[PDB]
């Protein structure tokens, strides 16, 4: 209804190949951009594809209150809202995570009665995940800002993953350009001492930020970060992974509830491949018995005859691709489905139905052969289940 | 040296636009691509971008363990990696948050002597904070698999986020290609009211799949799922998040050893930084326009770059090679394999260019493609953009 939106977007973390597709199709479609990235490789990127782009770093300076750059950088993209433009504001990584401005340009967007949306995007921590070859859902994970879990005493689980942001900066809240001495960093490693022990590790993670660099995976015990040489390798882009101490053992009560036991394997029994960070991990075999009899049915096999095999068109494809790639063409269809569905070309009458109505089955149904048999969707783990 | 290579990519949650751009670009530079996706839209996208594509979800069966089939997708993809091939696997999200085969399927790669890389993705925690206007680092934020939340009882804080994946199947380990009734669910409320009590916030979450769709973000009590007709809502895509139930308030120590005082005028363990999280219950109203923040706003008129701010000073050149190296991975594997007889054969670039990239070094290629003022010197201070209870 009323003019100007704001749109919040990230570029993740590598230089340009870490932007989504969808991140990318509203940078190009906005009317203006402001953006606020690390490497000058994704700034040249984004140049080119907006002639109307802004860099909000240099509302930085040295002395300067963060919080007041942050007032100053949300500001601008909300002015440019307020003039009834497409505005678009650019984050490295996800844009919502660990990121003051973005949170509150939208806020301030959506109370004032403007279209306001924040894109997801890949974070720090999405790619810690991939590097240390880790997930957060096997044995859980606790996720702080690192000042903020030592000011407030933030509650560490040692059966599950931690991951600490900003290691690099504790306590340290003002901007210079050259960076800063890390020199509140030893009241981190005491508490971490304290809650893991001195020679339990951590691993020192640095995500390429670069497509031809590796990343940084150096694991060292709480011990050895007082050394002056390794806490001097902490910086501004250093985050914290700690391991699990131990595993924690199943409770009998909800085993009962959940009917699990008629049993359920011992606590320290893991599912190939185990946490290579956790200290006295065992050697997990790869293939048992069970791995290499289920190896064996691969050469019989053929599809379940409840399996629904993808049976579409081109035209389908297309139009379902360009809402996707297109936030024209997606605010048109949003705005009128029947009057959208009518102008595609080439989709049958079973498409053009589908479309029109919007809703998930009926495209499903356009989309993909239902057989009889079916007529369940892949949560892809399981747990000590 | 080895012949052979696992890429594992994600395609994000939303259908389409939330694959990354060097997803897609290892999808078709692929030699076999496996998938394992939600969407028909997303599978058409996928199989215009790569001619030799197997669904893993066939795999999959009524009464067939999940490991099997596990097992089952993981061997298939590293069968093509020793035959020597550029394989590449495709998951839903990011290919490595509550994903088992993946994990399996990388591993073996690497501990054979293939290479073997995970390229992160967008994953339906990334999207529950982009929808619920949430930032895990304030007030920190714990992750749980809930049927796992509840076996081995892990430690909920009343003080941060809670997110739980998995909430429309408690305690099933089963496939079924109907989906499944989530009768053990109750177990699931119990817990959050022994936790919470029965008042507190549910945000009954779920990611919109296609562009056009929006996301459900539907708040209950703990009471309220207890109700038939609420609780038949969550399914195989739902999640839960649980916001803080209070405050926590600062310790004296590390604000004494952290030196962030003079007297005793450290915030109000409630003073929030605006916005305030709109899920906890009794928030109060914060105030976007603080006179603060109205005289930060008046200095944007007379504002001009600080002398060590940097501008861009690259050259079409540059900027064409460095995003062929993050968009093309065979490019990316030839400037890896020799950086001077790439960097060599790129055209049109400055001495410079070439030499930064002949090193490969992060500063050089920066200190290439930005102007480096004399202010700024080589001291031989990047964006980190947030501050918590400090200011
Ligand atoms: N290349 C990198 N490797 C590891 N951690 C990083 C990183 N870049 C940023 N971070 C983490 O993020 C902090 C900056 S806060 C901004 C984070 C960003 N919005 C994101 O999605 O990740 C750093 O202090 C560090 O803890
Ligand atoms: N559209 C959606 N909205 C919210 N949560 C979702 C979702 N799709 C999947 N999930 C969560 O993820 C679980 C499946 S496990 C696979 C998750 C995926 N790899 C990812 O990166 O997120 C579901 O039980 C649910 O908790």
Known sequence: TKAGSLTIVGTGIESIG????????????????????????????????????????????????????????????????????????????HPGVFVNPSHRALAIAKSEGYRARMLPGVSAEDCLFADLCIDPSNPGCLTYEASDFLIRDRPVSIHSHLVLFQVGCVGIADFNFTGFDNNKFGVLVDRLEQEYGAEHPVVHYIAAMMPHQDPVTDKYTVAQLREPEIAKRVGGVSTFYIPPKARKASNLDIIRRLELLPQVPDKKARIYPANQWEPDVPEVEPYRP????????????????????????????????????????????????????????????????????????????????????????????????
């Open 18 to 93: 870490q932007m989504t597709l969808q991140a990318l199709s509203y940078i190009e479609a906005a009317a203006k951009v402001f953006y606020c990235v690390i490497d000058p490789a994704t700034e040249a990127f984004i140049l080119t594809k907006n002639k109307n782009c802004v860099d909000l770093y240099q509302y930085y300076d040295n002395g300067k209150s963060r919080l007041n750059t942050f007032t100053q950088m949300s500001e601008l993209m909300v002015r440019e809202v307020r003039k009834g433009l497409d505005v678009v504001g650019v984050f490295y990584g």
């Open 290 to 385: 069970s791995d290499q009899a289920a190896i064996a049915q691969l050469a019989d096999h053929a599809p379940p005859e409840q399996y629904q095999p993808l049976a579409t068109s081109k035209a389908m494809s297309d139009v379902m691709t360009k809402l996707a790639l297109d936030p024209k063409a997606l605010a048109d269809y949003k705005a009128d489905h029947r009057a959208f569905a009518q102008s595609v070309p080439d989709l049958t009458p079973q498409e053009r139905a589908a479309l029109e109505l919007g809703d998930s089955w009926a495209i499903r149904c356009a989309m993909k052969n239902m057989p009889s048999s079916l007529l369940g969707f892949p949560w892809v783990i399981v747990v000590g289940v």
